[PDB]
């Protein structure tokens, strides 16, 4: 099956699996840095806010790590003065969403090999249209 539509749900995208946390896969922008991730934490269901920890590979090849609290807003994941919709997630292997006109697929470190859902690939495809993607996952540290 393929239940690909109507999983817009900032929240569900916003909590995944509640464990691990999320790479940046492929994206529509150049020049991206490498190494680009979120990791989750201090979920509030009752208010749909968490702490992000997210960053990219430093100089030395390290992650930065920047805290914010991220909000669910419908479709929107709200940083601060900055947006995502999520264009699809399941909770728990990888998101498509727009952010700032481009298109990223974000995928689960359980499944960085491969095997997650396959409507994000779908998905990824249908919203970028004719911009290339862009692998961002490249010689990478651990998780925080």
Known sequence: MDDCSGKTDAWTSIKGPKTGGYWLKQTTKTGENECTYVKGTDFKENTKTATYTYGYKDASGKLTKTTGTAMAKG??????????????????????????????????????????????????????????????????????
Do not use: Q
């Open 75 to 144: 479709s929107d994941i709200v940083v601060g003065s900055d947006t995502s919709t999520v264009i699809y997630t399941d909770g728990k292997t990888c998101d498509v969403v727009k952010h700032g006109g481009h298109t990223e697929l974000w995928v689960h470190s359980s499944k960085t090999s491969g095997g997650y859902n396959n409507c994000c690939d779908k998905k990824f495809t249908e919203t970028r249209g004719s911009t290339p993607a862009n692998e961002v996952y490249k010689k990478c540290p651990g998780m925080p």
